[PDB]
Amino acid sequence: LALSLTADQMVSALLDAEPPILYSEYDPTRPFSEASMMGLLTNLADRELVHMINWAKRVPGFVDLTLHDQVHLLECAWLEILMIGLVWRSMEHPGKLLFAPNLLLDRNQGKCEGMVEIFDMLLATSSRFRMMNLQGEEFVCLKSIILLNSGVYTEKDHIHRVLDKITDTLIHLMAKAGLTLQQQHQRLAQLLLILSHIRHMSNKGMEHLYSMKLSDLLLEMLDAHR
């Protein structure tokens, strides 16, 4: 199969497969209503989805899966992939969430309608990546893990095989960073444990999106969850 790349070739493929950072149809001269954020973040998530699909195709091993499996993995993990992408680019913005280069929000308009909690959780997640100095090479690996793991149950144990290769890729970065074996695998745990919270934020945002009920593609993703 294709999964023979060394850990450094793995990092290169993921780094080059990165989607772009899109902009928002945002008007700073206009105020922020509950529906304004609802409309802005919806259109931005919708235009990001088409990039995520093409990014997912460039993830090593994702092409080897059937169309039904690729649909399933993306239907369960897409909001996690937006969120950890959101959390990643908000790292150098303490106290703020950088939804887009022009859409930088804080814990004041984040309350603009249901549920703030996710907002602080995303902030704390971004604060978590900041305090531990998450490197881009480590971010692209975790984002790949989310795509493959969230729907491994929700044949194909090669998904586990690719997951094993991403794990090998991750500690390969940390070893080439002066981190002792103890500091190495406990770092690995801190990263994988954060993926639990991102799953939680996504499920909370998922059921919220179903309550406030947009994009035709976004509605196809909501029908998978319940």
């Binding site: 699909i53 169309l67 690729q70 649909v71 993306l74 239907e75 593609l217």
Partner: peptide, 9 residues
């Protein structure tokens, strides 16, 4: 599904 087509392009 719109998702099925985008993966097929």
């Amino acid at each position: 599904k719109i998702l099925h087509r985008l993966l097929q392009d």
